[PDB]
Nucleic acid binder design. Sequence first.
RNA 1: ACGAAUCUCUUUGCCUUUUGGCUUAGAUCAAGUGUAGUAUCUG
RNA 2: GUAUGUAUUUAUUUUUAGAUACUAACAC
Lengths: 123, 37, 35, 102, 145, 240, 337, 105, 124
Amino acid sequence: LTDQIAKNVKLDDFIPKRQSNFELSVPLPTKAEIQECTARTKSYIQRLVNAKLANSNNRASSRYVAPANLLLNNSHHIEVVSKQMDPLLPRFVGKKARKVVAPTENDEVVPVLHMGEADPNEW
Amino acid sequence: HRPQLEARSGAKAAAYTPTGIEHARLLPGHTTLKYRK
Amino acid sequence: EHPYGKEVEVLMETKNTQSPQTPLVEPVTERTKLQ
Amino acid sequence: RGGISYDQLAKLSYEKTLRNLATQTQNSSKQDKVQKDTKTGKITIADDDKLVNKLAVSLQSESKKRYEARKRQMQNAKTLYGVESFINDKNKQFNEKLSRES
Amino acid sequence: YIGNLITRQFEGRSNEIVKTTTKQRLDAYYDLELRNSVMDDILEMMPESIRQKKARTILQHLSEAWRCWKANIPWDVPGMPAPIKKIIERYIKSKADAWVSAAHYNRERIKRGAHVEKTMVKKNLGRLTRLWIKNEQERQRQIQK
Amino acid sequence: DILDLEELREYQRRKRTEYEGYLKRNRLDMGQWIRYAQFEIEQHDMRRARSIFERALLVDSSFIPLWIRYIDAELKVKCINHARNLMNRAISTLPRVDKLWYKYLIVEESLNNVEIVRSLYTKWCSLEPGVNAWNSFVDFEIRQKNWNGVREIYSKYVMAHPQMQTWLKWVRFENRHGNTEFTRSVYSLAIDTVANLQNLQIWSDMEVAKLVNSFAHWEAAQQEYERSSALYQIAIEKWP
Amino acid sequence: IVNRYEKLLSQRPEWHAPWKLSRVINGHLGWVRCVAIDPVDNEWFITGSNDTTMKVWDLATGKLKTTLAGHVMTVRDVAVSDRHPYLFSVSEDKTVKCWDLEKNQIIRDYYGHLSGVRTVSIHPTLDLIATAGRDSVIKLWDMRTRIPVITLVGHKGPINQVQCTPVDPQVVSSSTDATVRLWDVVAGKTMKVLTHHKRSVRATALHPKEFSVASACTDDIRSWGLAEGSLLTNFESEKTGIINTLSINQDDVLFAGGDNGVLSFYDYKSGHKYQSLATREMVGSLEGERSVLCSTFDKTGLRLITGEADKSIKIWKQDETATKESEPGLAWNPNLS
Amino acid sequence: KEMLAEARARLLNTQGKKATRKIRERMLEESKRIAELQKRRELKQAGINVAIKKPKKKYGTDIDYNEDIVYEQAPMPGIYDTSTEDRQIKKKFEQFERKVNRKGL
Amino acid sequence: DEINEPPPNICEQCLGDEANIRMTKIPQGSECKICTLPFTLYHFKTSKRSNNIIKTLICVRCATQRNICQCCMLDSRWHIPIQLRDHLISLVNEENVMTEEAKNDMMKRFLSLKNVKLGGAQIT
RNA sequence: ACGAAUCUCUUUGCCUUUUGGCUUAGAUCAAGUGUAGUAUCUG
RNA sequence: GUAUGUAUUUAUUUUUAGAUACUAACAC
Ligand SMILES: [Zn+2]
Ligand SMILES: [Zn+2]
């Protein structure tokens, strides 16, 4: 049953790896590996920024910027189409400032793992 | 009923819905970066 | 001075060299503009 | 002389409850498993209803005793020291903390 | 403008509203950063346990040491762990230097006589009289020694 | 006081609005959380109490009294399995805090189940906590039998705390139980490990002195002056 | 477990040379909170201050080039850019100001922190900024459009120190809840948590090569491998507390600035401490004012620059005599932990 | 003796203008509660049953803590699979409320 | 991004016998009938010429948690009212699996954000 | 004879209802005055 | 020549003189 009890925490997390052999080499992350993370991250951030600059109230700010649905078994397919808003009416009919308390969903526990008498008379 | 004892976590403000008011200082300015050699 | 006294240069700086307008990073002009 | 770190203290309390428990066992002598489903990993452990009630009663009892003793120190604490001037109870208590600081 | 007026009229005003530091609320923020910065240190020197009681207490000792620094009173606590006294002496020396430098700066701004607020004149006067008396007491003590 | 149901119902609403007011304003001040959960217990409603506690932990999990009262809230209402799951959460959060492990141990032994405490202490040993834990663990086995086991336990223990008084406890066990055969062999097992690794220098000289005197002196108690003086004599050679 | 202790006695680590004091520069009115160095030419410093200014010192002679004002309160952090001619400064006034090194004037202001912002780090390849402070969140700013693109919710307290890395975890952060998180920004959630510190982690530094980080606390300076997120090593430290800053030379020397004024140099590989110094306070200072607020090495790594709480910058040079005659430091005795 | 009595009066009170006011205002509120309660008891003695009122809503999103679990944080999942103890609990709880409807605490 | 990315959940029933369908997507529509938070809305018409118009009421989250259809609000598989399927399931076992729901506001506004997946849903 | 338990009291340990911010100490400083509503003290 | 705050449920949910007084947008 020993497996179940403190199942998460385990010894080898407390012990440092380089103390066995110094000079055990942690490689810096090559080159063509960073040219990847840089690519995907760059694209993602562009998606956020362009996603924002087309939101807000400036016909000015937009100059600095697919059926796609197989529903269920795809039987009925679909075609998805945006609707042009009456420019006067509010775009985003449902955007309204409201405050929300989010829950904190804790799936697992992160063990907090660390390694007076006369002292109080000092402190 | 006085002083801070804490600060406000930005986490809270992260979950709210945006208003979309347009401020004066976020109007586009210095719109082009500069790269070194 | 004496707190260090030998090798150490104790220098007290006020005012400025390099009048404030100077670029502090030189703009690279690739072409030479005669205009 | 002295303070005690929160570890040694923890050990001492553990020992204390061990002694108390062993006395319940001896006096009880004087008066006279693990199954885990395949479907879910939920473990189940057979229990005696006795000793569980005895446990709850032990916890409640000790809480009562602590609460009472502290309460008596409440009573004596305020009735002992009438020397200096005080506006309210809380003042007197604060100044007794000043007596502890000496 | 009217964009903001109406989008605020349908969608309500923003709940976040962070608010910047300006001429009026500056000193408050300076206080605040300071008391926090002392909390960190004096929590990290201590060996283990106690926080909130000793928090409020130690920060009170800060305030009292500041007042006693304005009044030129030496501020010894009859007993107190030395390292904490090192720390509080440090931060109060810091705040002192900032305060003095603000007094000089505002004075030499008034000598030119350019847009000083009605109160800043009064306050600045106060800081200068404090400083002047400190110079006086210094001169007298140094004459005794 | 309260009369009918709808009377009580308000008495809940009001108190709760006061509480969650003061907790709305102060996320900290755990006293208030503890008293509030305590209230929802005195209303015989557990679910609410548990929610209150869980929140109080999401705020701060490093304040143990909160943990302990949240355990005893489940025990006192005779809900055990909850007080188990809660424990594997607790110690797994804070494996260094001793009070947690000891508490879970006691709660297990008051239920007489000795296998769970056995595997428990095993795990609590694997993390190499310190002398108090191990000592409490052999003092566990003494309440049991495991005279075969307690040897293995001391084995692990002396490998994880290579100091004299650990070995001195080891032999003091046998001599307390008087068995001579193993005693001699183990006294041998200490000294040759000393001189074997002694170049590694961790054992202090005075330590060596106290260890020699124990084995030689005890052999003198066994009337093996030949053997005793033999040992002591080798010790002269191996040392300045 | 003794087997580990033997395996600590085989290595006999990594000789280095001691350090000494080359130069003292007065000239700030308040404390010196932060220091950064021109990443290309090594021609200068930018030093924050507690007087709100920033004074650009020449590295060669130590003379003062220019002064950059513009913040109303103390400047906790300063960071200069590689690819750009930009300087991002950040303060307790809730604001992150860009600076165009060409014309020496504020270009942009980034807005949106709730309170004082104690750290800026400039992502190497993305044209981002990472800022953090008592908000308890890390804000990833788009450098061009001043839009706080991503926000990283996480630590349960203030955030002291933040770093950026080109591959995974692209942001490393350290907070007063005594943790260090390794972030995955695209998904926007913690990739790994490192809890091993017992108190506020007040300083970190990235090794310029090995792709690891050195984290600090009161008495214990650990190291951490990135990628996997393993522990790598520990560093031998009796009470040095409090560790205000760390800096890693290209030679695998790990500096540790004290609040007791002690300069504790380490080898990075081993964990050994080969030197400890004590600074001289100053002519009229207090014994309390002797401490080390920040520090860095030049691009070479043969000079060290430490702002101190005595209102002075000190420049520590590595001795050229040294070798084995008498360098030897404390000489590698691994006490039991 | 007059100014001494007055001195004795001022030195013993630290309540303050706002604090004294909140004490007395709280007394007023509790009095109002007592009044409404005994109203309901008297009307009950005549058989007419009237429910208590919720004190409106200060602001739009205001919460009534009685009506629902405020923020329900599940304790966790866990290996020991309680699932029985919950039954005994609910039995004890419904027992409690089923008592209050009669003996009335 | 977060709101768009999950695709809609629609029954095959109410979506009609037409082979290919044109549906409109509004990036902020009404709030849920449930959680009271914004989301993305979808028109469509069963027939091309049918006068009646179908409008997804609830979120994707507030649906997925309950495992129902956004237009119908019937169970995604059995085409059953939520208040029923949990009664059938509750018939097996004994007493459980009732879906407890969210009075006040930020009770519900809160609740929709957790990943729980609901009492009723888990069996289906 | 000592081991063990309950109750009571005293001493040590733990602190229990035991001072929660900044600015020019944040600034200032009395018989003060007439009449009037209402409380109540004495023959 | 007081902000501000609380409450405003009507239409019926199944079983003998005055002294010491407090105060007053009321009279320098
Ligand atoms: Zn919804
Ligand atoms: Zn449908």
